[PDB]
């Protein structure tokens, strides 16, 4: 199992006309596999949607993925911006 | 377009780790 493969490639034709949105070298970088989209980085480790307790067929349409991601409440953020100045 | 072999970018491990960025240490004329 090797480590030092290249795994990125560049085509010789300068097509740099409509490409300011992609990832440029500074040309266009062309990798050997796709990307990986990760929804939320921090798992919410309790929350019986995920913990599955052993007590007591049901569906639930939760709002967004933001339930599973430890977001702070806004009153603390306003308190901290008041503590800013 | 299907005959357009691409250029590998080699990393060369010792370049990736710790390369710094000689007359500017004045002891050698």
């Amino acid at each position: 199992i090797m480590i030092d493969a290249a795994s990125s490639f560049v085509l010789p034709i300068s097509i740099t006309k409509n490409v300011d949105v992609l990832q440029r070298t500074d040309e266009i970088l062309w990798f050997r596999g796709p990307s990986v989209i990760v929804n939320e980085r921090i798992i919410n480790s309790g929350d019986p949607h995920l913990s599955l307790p052993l007590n007591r067929n049901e569906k639930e349409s939760l709002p967004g993925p933001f339930v599973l991601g430890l977001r702070p409440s806004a009153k603390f953020t306003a308190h901290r911006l008041s503590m800013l100045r | 377009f299907e005959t357009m072999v691409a250029n590998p970018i080699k990393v060369s491990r010792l370049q990736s780790n710790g390369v710094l960025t000689i007359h500017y240490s004045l002891a050698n004329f």
């Binding site: - | 500017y24 240490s25 004045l26 002891a27 004329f29």
Partner: protein
């Protein structure tokens, strides 16, 4: 490292034959020397002065030469043409 040795430059004869310095021994900011101006502890800054890269470029390496009740003073003149 990065330290200048304490000796081994004796650029004196080229200033004797510089023809700008008014030395009568031979015939054939806005300051000039940084003896009042700091250089923020880089020796390379002293290479901006035009009489000092003259003593690093045109210098050489020298080897050191090694060695009554009332004084009577006598003046001695010296006048020799040579080449």
């Amino acid at each position: 490292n990065q330290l200048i040795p304490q000796a081994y430059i004796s650029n004196f004869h080229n200033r004797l034959t510089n023809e700008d310095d008014g030395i009568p021994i031979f015939t054939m900011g806005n300051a000039v020397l940084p003896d009042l101006q700091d250089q923020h502890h880089n020796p390379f800054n002293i290479l901006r002065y035009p009489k000092i890269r003259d003593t690093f470029i045109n210098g050489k390496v020298v080897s050191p030469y090694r060695l009554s009740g009332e004084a009577i003073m006598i003046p001695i003149t010296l006048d020799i043409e040579h080449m």
